[PDB]
Amino acid sequence: SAVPSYLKDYAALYKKDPRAAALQYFKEAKFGLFIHYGLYSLLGRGEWVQLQGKIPVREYAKLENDFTAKNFDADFITDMALEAGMKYVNITTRHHDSFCLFESKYTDFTSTNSPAKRDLVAELAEECRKKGLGFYLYYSHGRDWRHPHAPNNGDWGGNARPKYDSPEPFYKYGEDQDLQIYVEFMKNQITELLTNYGPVGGIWLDGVATPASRKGKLHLFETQELYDHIHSLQPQVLVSYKQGLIGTEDFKAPERHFKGTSDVPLEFCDTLQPWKWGYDKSLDGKHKTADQVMEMLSKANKMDANLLLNVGPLPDGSIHPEDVKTLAEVGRKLKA
Numbered sequence: 001s002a003v004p005s006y007l008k009d010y011a012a013l014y015k016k017d018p019r020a021a022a023l024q025y026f027k028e029a030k031f032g033l034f035i036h037y038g039l040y041s042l043l044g045r046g047e048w049v050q051l052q053g054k055i056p057v058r059e060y061a062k063l064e065n066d067f068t069a070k071n072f073d074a075d076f077i078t079d080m081a082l083e084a085g086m087k088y089v090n091i092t093t094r095h096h097d098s099f100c101l102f103e104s105k106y107t108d109f110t111s112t113n114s115p116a117k118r119d120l121v122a123e124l125a126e127e128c129r130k131k132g133l134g135f136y137l138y139y140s141h142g143r144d145w146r147h148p149h150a151p152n153n154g155d156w157g158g159n160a161r162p163k164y165d166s167p168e169p170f171y172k173y174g175e176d177q178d179l180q181i182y183v184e185f186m187k188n189q190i191t192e193l194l195t196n197y198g199p200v201g202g203i204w205l206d207g208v209a210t211p212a213s214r215k216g217k218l219h220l221f222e223t224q225e226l227y228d229h230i231h232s233l234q235p236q237v238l239v240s241y242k243q244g245l246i247g248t249e250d251f252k253a254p255e256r257h258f259k260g261t262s263d264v265p266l267e268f269c270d271t272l273q274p275w276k277w278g279y280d281k282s283l284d285g286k287h288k289t290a291d292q293v294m295e296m297l298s299k300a301n302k303m304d305a306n307l308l309l310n311v312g313p314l315p316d317g318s319i320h321p322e323d324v325k326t327l328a329e330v331g332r333k334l335k336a
Helices: 018-029 057-066 074-084 120-131 179-195 223-233 290-302 321-334
Strands: 031-035 088-094 134-140 202-206 238-241 266-271 305-311
Touching: 018 134, 018 238, 031 074, 031 134, 074 088, 074 120, 074 321, 088 120, 120 134, 134 179, 179 202, 179 223, 223 238, 266 290, 290 305, 290 321
Parallel strands: 031 088, 031 305, 088 134, 134 202, 202 238, 266 305
Antiparallel strands: none
């Protein structure tokens, strides 16, 4: 009962150390589904199109007028994962473009506001609770390309913000910018995710390269205070931040591979599309094959790491037919 489904084979440990139970479940899950769905999926040129296309903030915000998510089926997605042999699911609640797939009282730039009128995080959370799958939340942290107070391209690097040819009117600059408005905005949104969707597996932070580009300035993000707020918000939630920003994360989530060894659990995240998370139409017929996934899984076990394998849905919210087959066969090879 109090033991959440995702960690039901670790109840005893849970009734002794909830977070221990979480780490254990995680270190042993081995396989998971990453989902990158958002406004970028409509342009089909990747998830960094706002930057790689220097699309101004206002022009990009017109994509909400075309966001319906008609064929986004959390039932099929949760089922696909299970059959494939995956034990948990991870979705981008809000990427660098700052569009949210969940209802938020601190922004109207959400999928609930859009023609879709749906809380896709709520939809996915229930399907995970129903099916015993772990549920993890990608949330853009070190980079934001919309919020006026988020790191700018002068003070911070990375690629903090799209390098526009004329200053973007939506951004405040210099003295007109107090990151603390942004810092609190994230902490406010993360509070919503941990409260409105029941027990959550972890907060999956991204964008590490930007705060680390000025790491004597790193402390203004109040990141450790964010970790503390997350652990205080629920007993068992984990926090990751790619390979690590301040060293106090519950696990390390490097992209694709990790050199060296780590004090904490490892999770390699990789793509079913060549190089690009997020739907890229130019890559059709070139998605990875079930035999390549077996390699990725093998390599990951060698490294004592999970494999978090990504699907980037089609503009309507449906899973690419190449990835559906690939995952369907990975499941059959695995149960053998």
